[PDB]
Amino acid sequence: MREIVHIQAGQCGNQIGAKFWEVISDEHGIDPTGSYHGDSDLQLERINVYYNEATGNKYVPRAILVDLEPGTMDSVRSGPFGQIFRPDNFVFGQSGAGNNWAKGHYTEGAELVDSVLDVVRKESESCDCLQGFQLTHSLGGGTGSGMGTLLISKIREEYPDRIMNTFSVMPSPKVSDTVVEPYNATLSVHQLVENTDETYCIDNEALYDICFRTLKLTTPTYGDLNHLVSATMSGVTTCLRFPGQLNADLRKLAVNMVPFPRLHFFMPGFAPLQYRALTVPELTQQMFDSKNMMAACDPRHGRYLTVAAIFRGRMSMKEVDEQMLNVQNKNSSYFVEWIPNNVKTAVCDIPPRGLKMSATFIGNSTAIQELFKRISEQFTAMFRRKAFLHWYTGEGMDEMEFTEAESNMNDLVSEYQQYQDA
Amino acid sequence: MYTFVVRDENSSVYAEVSRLLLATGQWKRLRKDNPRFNLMLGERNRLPFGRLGHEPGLVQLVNYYRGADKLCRKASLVKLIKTSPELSESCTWFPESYVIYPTDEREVFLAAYNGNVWIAKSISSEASELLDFIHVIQKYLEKPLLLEPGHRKFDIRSWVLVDHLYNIYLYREGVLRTSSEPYNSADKTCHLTNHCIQKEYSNYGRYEEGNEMFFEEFNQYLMDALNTTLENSILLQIKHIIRSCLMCIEPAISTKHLHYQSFQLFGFDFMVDEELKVWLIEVNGAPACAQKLYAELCQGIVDVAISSVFPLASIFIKL
Amino acid sequence: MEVIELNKCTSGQSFEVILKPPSDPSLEEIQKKLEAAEERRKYQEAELLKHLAE
Amino acid sequence: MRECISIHVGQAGVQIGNACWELYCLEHGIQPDGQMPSDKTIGGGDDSFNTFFSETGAGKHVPRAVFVDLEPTVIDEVRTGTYRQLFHPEQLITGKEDAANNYARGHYTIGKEIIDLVLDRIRKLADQCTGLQGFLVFHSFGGGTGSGFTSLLMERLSVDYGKKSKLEFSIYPAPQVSTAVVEPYNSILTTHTTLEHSDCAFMVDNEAIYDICRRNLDIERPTYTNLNRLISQIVSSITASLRFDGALNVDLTEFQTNLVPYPRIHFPLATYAPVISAEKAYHEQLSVAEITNACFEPANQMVKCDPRHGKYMACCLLYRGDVVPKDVNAAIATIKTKRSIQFVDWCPTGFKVGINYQPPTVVPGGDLAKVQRAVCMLSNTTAIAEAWARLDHKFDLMYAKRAFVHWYVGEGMEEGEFSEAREDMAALEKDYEEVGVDS
Ligand SMILES: Nc1nc2c(ncn2[C@@H]2O[C@H](COP(=O)(O)OP(=O)(O)OP(=O)(O)O)[C@@H](O)[C@H]2O)c(=O)[nH]1
Ligand SMILES: Nc1ncnc2c1ncn2[C@@H]1O[C@H](COP(=O)(O)OP(=O)(O)CP(=O)(O)O)[C@@H](O)[C@H]1O
Ligand SMILES: COc1cc2c(c(OC)c1OC)-c1ccc(OC)c(=O)cc1[C@@H](NC(C)=O)CC2
Ligand SMILES: Nc1nc2c(ncn2[C@@H]2O[C@H](COP(=O)(O)OP(=O)(O)O)[C@@H](O)[C@H]2O)c(=O)[nH]1
Ligand SMILES: [Ca+2]
Ligand SMILES: [Ca+2]
Ligand SMILES: [Mg+2]
Ligand SMILES: [Mg+2]
Ligand SMILES: [Mg+2]
């Protein structure tokens, strides 16, 4: 029955994961106590994808909360929808990871990883037919980055034929916590290239710019950034959660979006970012606009390999089809000509909360190489002088492992440029 | 913003057409293998008509009629005229022709052979010399209209545009490709009026510039020398022949109810005898134009053949 | 134009009109194909599990 | 009486199968519960409709059909639908997870694990047959199941039922109607493997049906229900001769005999007329001449192509309703002097005509208006090769970069099969050219 097991790891992963569950619970009419109080059976038709059904017809998120310190998960448990989560699905340590990939991946994380897999195993057993896994985390910290990728590796070992999907938050100096973020991100990307089928690249620089320049927020907070991510995650998973014309799961998505195994890093987008309803041409225009992208990459600096678009709300399906075809026909140079009809659109009649209609963008563009280039430069700037390396070598790592991760990411960049000139 | 592709770099006519499209700011040229186009300036050979009109949200137009090769090939034209009831063997404006393979009309040609001068193509009074050379064998017009002074031969080229609605437009400006050498009914330079031949084997450009006489001069000549006009003595027959050929093949090539649309520029070649009778020589599917007529004609193509389908933000005679 | 083979019944009729005269792999082989692909999947997975073991 | 077993594979096959059997029941006067008041011979008989329907002691008329899909959601709508009582539970076979638009996954990975179950359930129906003719296989080209599992099924059917004819109803992929980017791959892969196992295949281009529904039915965005009910009419017209009294195409063998001179070139072009909107209050009934002339209009074809620039090998006219042979001949004689109908020199320039007096049945509340006469033309034209060329070109574009190939290789398929399948299609295009084109 296409069940998905959700995992959220670290501070960022849990804070965005919590918001995601708050949003879709509302869309499915699930109250903070886990009771259904909706008005449409369309909300319950595919509820099993993300929710287990309890004893007294209560719905419990198939979610596992992981962290190396109890702080954020104490906040989640005390949050608005904090009581909806299964108490046994809270797996945490006390040491923390100190924004250190090595601690998350090799030392502190290794002590906790088996306990997480136990809960993962238990959730998978309650699935009629496990579709795949979904992970929310950041790449700049220690737990989400280090332990998160360790989890992914452990999961692939036990479930080699299941789809692995991540929403990965990319660090940036503009919204930074520590200077070692490029180290942690580069080490993680190496893991993601090999062990994920689909990765949504969420750039904190893009999230900030959207809040500052577009939403007119002079002082954006993580909460403001997470609002955008929460909305994007809802739209991305729309065809998973709601009945519609589209009969497809995560594997069908991966098959059609990923022409080459390593190139599975997507640029998410959302529109609108007010009481004035948007016309279909406006939704389509904004959706393809760089300012609505969340990877901080200019799509005009590359070419689209594949594009997926999801429109939500009651609108003319003809007008949607016309506008989508319009964009392709007006900008044919930004789409690869060696993949016929590489832009697909799906429509869901059910709009999200607060909007009469909206559009979600999922692009596999070669322009994403700008994100990895940026990280690679910040990495190299420090690594050439071996700056801050002692935090990692003190945890048993050697310089060779950094060189390899750096090499693999630069290879990833070159492979994107290779198909940009095809 | 309309989009188009170019798949024939050797096209003189459509190199100017694409230039004009870009000079409107409403047309954009795409890569040759880009399927997301509105207009296609296709290749002369093996044009993939089968891939046209299958792209969603795109009205597609092509500068060639599929099946028009039946009219624009030597042997196909002869076969078409004979086997079509609307043309028949009693065509009257097309010289007696026979298709000969090196079907076929070999015995029938000899039966008519027995002025007995013919010409083979794909000039001799002996049938034995013709066959041993070999294609189509056509009766050579031994009595052509000769321009004076010079006592010289000529042919008439007419440009015809047929749009997507199958309207037949005749360009006002035709051209006479004349011979610069005096005619001799007893050396095939004064017998062949091709521009490439006259610019080589010939006294070239003695009478007119580049052996090209245009309609206004030729009309004035007819009035002075024969007391008649170009319209009456010649153009009436030309317009008739053009209309006969294009209407005959219409139901076979019309894109009226097709998933894609077609238009095409044609080059009709005529011969005029001393009785002021017009004979059709052949039809060109990919013709070139006169140098001084490129500007006007190509703009005419954009106006009635292209913009009629894709409107932006007469030099033709409708037949 | 000739009409031939005219057959009639309560439900309808049929005929032919002429206008112009004219001028496998065995079960075993399939099993091998399926098993060969299965073994190629097994090898690729074993390589993955080996790579993860390293 | 000789029986025919229908097999529906994947979402497209199943949903189209639903539309067909719905129509079949309406045409034969069979109620959704299986009861048929017209049938006086209770619990048995060898009537023409018994070719598609078996009978139980309770008087229920059960379709000789099998529904197979690698995921349960589509077939589940049959199990709980209007015709839930019509089918035996055994006939409705479902798997756990689908082929994910991957030919290799449907053919090799999942197919291996479920093929024996399917054949066994088919064997059940075969044992009820006194003289099984063969099979009718409905599927899409683009689906992982429709392409992958079908080709495997066709191979095994040739083994277990060697003397039996197999006919195909295939859905050709169109970007206007929900395609995946990898569907050109699946199309070529399945056509290559199924080619030697199919005696006659009817291709239906989703683009054509989509445009017919927009143009003739005034539906801006046709749903699958709109498309399938139109498809079911064409399918009904083709199989009417098997289900009713007649003398043309009475067995599956006749389809090959009358339409397929060369085994590989077994893809007849279908053309249907008229398609009239039910919302259209005032409409003039078309004559025999008018609906016959409409058979030579590209806009009414199941596959968009130009028969004017191809050659005919065979032509069959299937009329339903108020039609007499006199009007047919008067129409044909007229059409020949207006249309460009070129037959190959080694074939008789002629038409095999079949007429069923009962006018086309339409689903109550449907989009199709009731007409007094309609015709389906089945003609084997080399012009249908345009569809192969379009499809092969899209294959070439992606395969030149080896795009998406890793998904197929990851399922145990070898990369060589891609080239092997493409070379077979290249040969197929060449066959059409040798037969249809002059130098
Ligand atoms: N005409 C018509 N076409 C359909 C229908 N359903 C799917 N298709 C077409 O089939 C193609 C996709 O294949 P499907 O049949 O949906 O997939 P499948 O056979 O179930 O195989 P899976 O990938 O395992 O799901 C698309 O090109 C659709 O246009 C239908 O009900 N009617
Ligand atoms: N039956 C005939 N009688 C007299 N002159 C003839 C003739 N047939 C051809 N010609 C002469 O033939 C010359 C034209 O060439 P023709 O039309 O035969 O083919 P071509 O070699 O020009 C191919 P294209 O027109 O595509 O360039 C003219 O100069 C004309 O004088
Ligand atoms: C589970 O949800 C989705 C699943 C899929 C697709 C998709 O994007 C529209 C989804 O929504 C996010 C999808 C994507 C892209 C394609 O080409 C780029 C394609 O061929 C095809 C598709 C989907 N198929 C169709 C016909 O849209 C199947 C896989
Ligand atoms: N968008 C977003 N980014 C965050 C959030 N919290 C932390 N980050 C980013 O994640 C990185 C820090 O990693 P973090 O998750 O806090 O450490 P961890 O607990 O070890 O996984 C930095 O680049 C932060 O910018 C959040 O709530 N939202
Ligand atoms: Ca410890
Ligand atoms: Ca009975
Ligand atoms: Mg932190
Ligand atoms: Mg010439
Ligand atoms: Mg399916």
Side-chain angles (χ1 to χ4, degrees), chain D residues 193-260:
Chain D
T193 305
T194 311
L195 198 56
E196 302 297 328
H197 304 280
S198 184
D199 303 285
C200 186
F202 301 100
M203 279 192 302
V204 176
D205 193 336
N206 268 343
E207 182 185 50
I209 307 296
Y210 176 74
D211 285 326
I212 293 175
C213 288
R214 289 175 64 187
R215 194 191 317 110
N216 302 24
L217 302 179
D218 288 325
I219 311 176
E220 289 190 355
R221 285 300 176 267
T223 64
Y224 276 140
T225 299
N226 299 134
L227 302 176
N228 296 340
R229 284 179 175 169
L230 178 53
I231 296 177
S232 67
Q233 291 290 340
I234 278 77
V235 174
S236 175
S237 302
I238 300 176
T239 63
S241 58
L242 302 167
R243 300 179 286 111
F244 293 96
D245 198 343
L248 177 66
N249 294 342
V250 295
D251 54 31
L252 297 181
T253 303
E254 279 200 41
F255 283 97
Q256 178 269 327
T257 301
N258 297 334
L259 298 171
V260 186

Side-chain angles (χ1 to χ4, degrees), chain B residues 121 138-139 141 153 191 193-194 269 281-282 284:
Chain B
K121 49 186 177 180
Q138 185 174 75
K139 183 66 190 68
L141 306 181
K153 194 180 178 180
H191 286 258
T193 56
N194 291 16
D269 297 333
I281 294 303
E282 79 155 65
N284 277 93

Side-chain angles (χ1 to χ4, degrees), chain B residues 278-293:
Chain B
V278 173
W279 300 83
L280 173 62
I281 294 303
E282 79 155 65
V283 184
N284 277 93
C289 185
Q291 179 57 52
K292 84 162 195 177
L293 300 179

Side-chain angles (χ1 to χ4, degrees), chain C residues 1 3 7 9-20 22-23 25 27 30-31 34 37-38 40-41 44, chain D residues 108-109 112 156 159 245 247 325 329 332 336 345 347-353 355-357 409-412 414:
Chain C
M1 189 163 185
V3 174
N7 315 90
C9 66
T10 310
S11 301
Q13 50 186 315
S14 62
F15 60 97
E16 182 177 5
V17 44
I18 305 180
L19 311 176
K20 179 193 302 179
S23 301
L27 173 58
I30 298 175
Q31 288 288 341
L34 296 180
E38 181 184 34
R40 285 190 294 272
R41 286 194 308 271
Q44 292 164 8
Chain D
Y108 295 104
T109 306
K112 177 180 179 296
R156 288 290 289 268
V159 175
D245 198 343
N329 295 327
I332 296 179
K336 272 296 299 178
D345 299 330
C347 260
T349 305
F351 300 86
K352 285 189 174 62
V353 183
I355 301 177
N356 194 313
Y357 292 152
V409 175
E411 296 290 353
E414 293 183 343

Side-chain angles (χ1 to χ4, degrees), chain A residues 113-275 277-285:
Chain A
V113 64
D114 287 344
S115 304
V116 179
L117 293 179
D118 290 336
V119 183
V120 175
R121 192 171 301 105
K122 187 175 185 178
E123 289 290 348
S124 294
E125 290 173 356
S126 69
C127 296
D128 180 51
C129 186
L130 178 62
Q131 176 184 171
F133 298 89
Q134 170 179 310
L135 173 74
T136 58
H137 65 150
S138 64
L139 301 190
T143 305
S145 189
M147 192 188 182
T149 54
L150 178 67
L151 280 176
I152 293 179
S153 185
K154 286 292 191 300
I155 289 171
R156 192 184 183 186
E157 187 177 20
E158 190 166 339
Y159 310 88
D161 61 335
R162 299 297 91 186
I163 294 297
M164 173 64 65
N165 185 96
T166 72
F167 296 82
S168 306
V169 177
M170 311 286 168
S172 87
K174 188 52 208 170
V175 196
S176 177
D177 294 340
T178 62
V179 295
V180 294
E181 290 167 354
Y183 278 164
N184 302 329
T186 297
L187 293 167
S188 283
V189 168
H190 186 4
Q191 301 293 319
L192 300 179
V193 168
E194 288 189 347
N195 299 327
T196 71
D197 299 285
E198 294 151 336
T199 288
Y200 297 92
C201 300
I202 302 162
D203 198 341
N204 264 4
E205 190 176 6
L207 297 183
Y208 184 88
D209 292 331
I210 292 172
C211 291
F212 182 82
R213 303 172 184 171
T214 301
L215 302 186
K216 301 307 179 188
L217 302 172
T218 169
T219 319
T221 62
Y222 279 133
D224 296 334
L225 272 52
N226 298 342
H227 171 264
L228 298 175
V229 187
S230 198
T232 301
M233 293 182 58
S234 169
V236 148
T237 64
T238 293
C239 295
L240 294 168
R241 298 182 292 105
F242 291 107
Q245 41 129 156
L246 198 49
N247 192 349
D249 48 24
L250 284 178
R251 185 174 282 103
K252 274 187 180 179
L253 183 63
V255 165
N256 293 293
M257 289 291 293
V258 186
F260 310 98
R262 293 166 51 91
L263 309 187
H264 57 259
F265 296 87
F266 303 151
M267 291 180 49
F270 187 85
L273 295 173
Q274 200 72 286
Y275 312 101
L278 277 73
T279 69
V280 173
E282 292 171 1
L283 267 185
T284 313
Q285 182 273 332

Side-chain angles (χ1 to χ4, degrees), chain A residues 2 247 252, chain D residues 10-11 69 71 74 98 145:
Chain A
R2 293 164 176 165
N247 192 349
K252 274 187 180 179
Chain D
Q11 172 176 314
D69 197 12
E71 59 107 5
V74 182
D98 60 33
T145 302

